[PDB]
Amino acid sequence: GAKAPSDFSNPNTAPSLSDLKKVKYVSTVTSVATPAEIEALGKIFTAMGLAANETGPAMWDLARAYADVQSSKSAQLIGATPSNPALSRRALAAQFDRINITPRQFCMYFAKVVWNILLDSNIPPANWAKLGYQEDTKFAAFDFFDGVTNPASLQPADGLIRQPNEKELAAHSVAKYGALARQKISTGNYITTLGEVTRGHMGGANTMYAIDAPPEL
Amino acid sequence: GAKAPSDFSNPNTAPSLSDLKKVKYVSTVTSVATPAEIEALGKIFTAMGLAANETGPAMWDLARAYADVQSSKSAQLIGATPSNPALSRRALAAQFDRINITPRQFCMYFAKVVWNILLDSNIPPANWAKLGYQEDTKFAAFDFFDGVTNPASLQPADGLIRQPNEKELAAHSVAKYGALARQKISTGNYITTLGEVTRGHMGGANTMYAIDAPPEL
Amino acid sequence: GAKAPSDFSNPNTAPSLSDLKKVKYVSTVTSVATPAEIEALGKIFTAMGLAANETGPAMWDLARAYADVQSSKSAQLIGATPSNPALSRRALAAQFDRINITPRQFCMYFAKVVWNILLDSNIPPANWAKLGYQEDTKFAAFDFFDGVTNPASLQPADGLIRQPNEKELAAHSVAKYGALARQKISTGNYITTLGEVTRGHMGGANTMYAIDAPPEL
RNA sequence: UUUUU
RNA sequence: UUUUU
RNA sequence: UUUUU
RNA sequence: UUUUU
RNA sequence: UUUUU
């Protein structure tokens, strides 16, 4: 009975919204890598050297490298892929810039896969004492942890081993602001660089004030 | 003689209300899973791997897993189904989110079946000493115990083995408020998470005050 | 007459539920160690040094070590196994992390065996005056006491020497909350650690307030 | 190792 | 010299 | 002039 | 050895 | 007599 979706006014209904909304899109936020671009990255890695038989596990090993040392432009992954010698993970880390993809965006795609292949063993990430995570939440001490809680990750058929607790998210939240601010004190509140604005100085006057005086630069 | 139900005013009568009220619905409360959705869950389990011959007993075994460790999102069921190897109960526990069903809602559907297959033997649930249930009411020490007292459960032709006593309900009532409050003291009275509101702290100052001072946070 | 378990709706019955439910599983809760993993731990101990003739008694001696000093990651068992010199129980305590098993989970497997080899003599655990257990319930003053009341323990053919009384469980319940809170006052309600959040301070302002003022941090 | 309406 | 789910 | 695990 | 929108 | 990523 109800017709005319071209009116641009009429109310939508349950059976229409269930089937016309073709899974919306997926969950294509700009902070996470789309499956179309990584498909082309699968092609270029196989074109560069890899076999078509083993590709995904090289992505998961590279994601586990990003799980250990945190995601950045100067991350420095240092290691060869388990597929074969000579091909360094630095070459795969350098290739991301050709297709306009950030490693931070790329690693959230395999955040559930990292969480699966991390939590099955009793092995944590390489560094969790510096950032200030507790021993109970030491497995959660890594970048792209928000990739487990969103639909953008691949979400395999078996599913996640366990749903992350609120204490992991709360610890990851304050650790982000703590780690970002700790960096921001060293060379913050200026954008020009150059040398004329910043006559010398460059870095701030340490993070030692934070423990003594609440206000910071 | 009495006619015109479309008047929207006239009084209803015994023979009309007996037959026009087609069993009302069944007892479709949102806290318990409807038989239409579990029928589709029976289809997806058979589609995933199971045979059509044995399906219900896999639900009852999964319900007995929920009977042991209590119903939650981070429950962690850890075990293979008795139908066949490889298919973990974690995969069935992960599949509930596709059809917008909670495990807590699902397990109340087989609460009478769990009560039947529990009470026929002399075996209690895995944990009844921590929650504080007495040895007489140790069989009642499990989640979805309210599923036995409502019509939403399947209520098989043989019926229940025994009607639960008031001491089981009274023990289950105070155990709910005790178990919920015990959790609530650890990270209660805040919803934002994030890290800016909760600067650190996170957890409360233990449940050891409860035994000494009546008022709590 | 009654057929079709693949319908995913039909009611289950007594003779079907008696035999189709193949002992459910056993009582596989995540808080207690499964018999499959300890079988591999039996292999690695024999591979490391032990004979296949004597293995179980080394587990029971190690369980009796966990009976004395309470189960923890910093427990510090300090002693050689009675099988042979050189092989310390610290090495067996360190080996648990390879197979993703906690000592707390492991020791509940031999809780009935500890209760049998403790109660046959008139010897209690090493420390029962500090935790606040009475002389009547001094034998019950140890961790993994909930392992006697569940089916996960091995339950030998002779059975338990005696069924634990309600006074032992009630004393063990309040002793858990007392011991946990006593620890929680020292470095509680914060998860980041690090040094920036906790400028100094670290520990709370003692448990001496508990005896004077009911509310605590 | 009971989060709801 | 009881950290959990 | 009780520091622990 | 968390730079964003 | 803790310089980093």
Residue numbers in the entry:
A (entry chain A), B (entry chain A), C (entry chain A): 21 to 237
Article passage:
Flexible filamentous viruses are ubiquitous plant pathogens that have an enormous impact in agriculture. Their infective particles are non-enveloped and flexible rod-shaped virions and contain several hundreds of copies of a coat protein (CP) arranged in a helical fashion protecting a ssRNA of positive polarity, or (+)ssRNA. Pepino mosaic virus (PepMV) is another potexvirus which has emerged recently, progressing from endemic to epidemic in tomato crops causing severe economic losses worldwide. PepMV is transmitted by mechanical contact and virions contain a (+)ssRNA of about 6.4 kb. The PepMV CP is strictly required for cell-to-cell movement of the virus.
We present the cryoEM structure of PepMV virions at 3.9 Å of resolution. The cryoEM map reveals a left-handed helix with a diameter of 130 Å and an inner narrow channel of 13 Å, and the structure shows a pitch of 34.6 Å and 8.7 CP copies per turn. The PepMV CP structure thus generated has three major regions: the core; an N-terminal flexible arm; and a C-terminal extension. The first 20 amino acids in the N-terminal side are not included in the atomic model because the region projects outwards, and its density vanishes due to high flexibility. Each CP binds five ribonucleotides, so that the entire genome of PepMV would require 1290 copies of PepMV CP spanning 510 nm (3.95 Å of axial rise/subunit), which agrees with the 509 nm length originally reported for the virus. In order to explore the protein–ssRNA interactions, we modeled a polyU and included a set of four PepMV CP monomers in a molecular dynamics flexible fitting (MDFF) simulation. The results show that the RNA resides in a continuous groove with a high electropositive potential constructed by CPs from consecutive turns of the helix. Three polar-charged residues, R124, D163, and K196 might establish H-bonding contacts with this RNA base. The N-terminal arm from the Ni subunit interacts with a hydrophobic groove of the Ni-1 subunit and establishes the main side-by-side contact in the helical arrangement. Thus, the C-terminal extensions are responsible for the axial interactions that support helix formation.
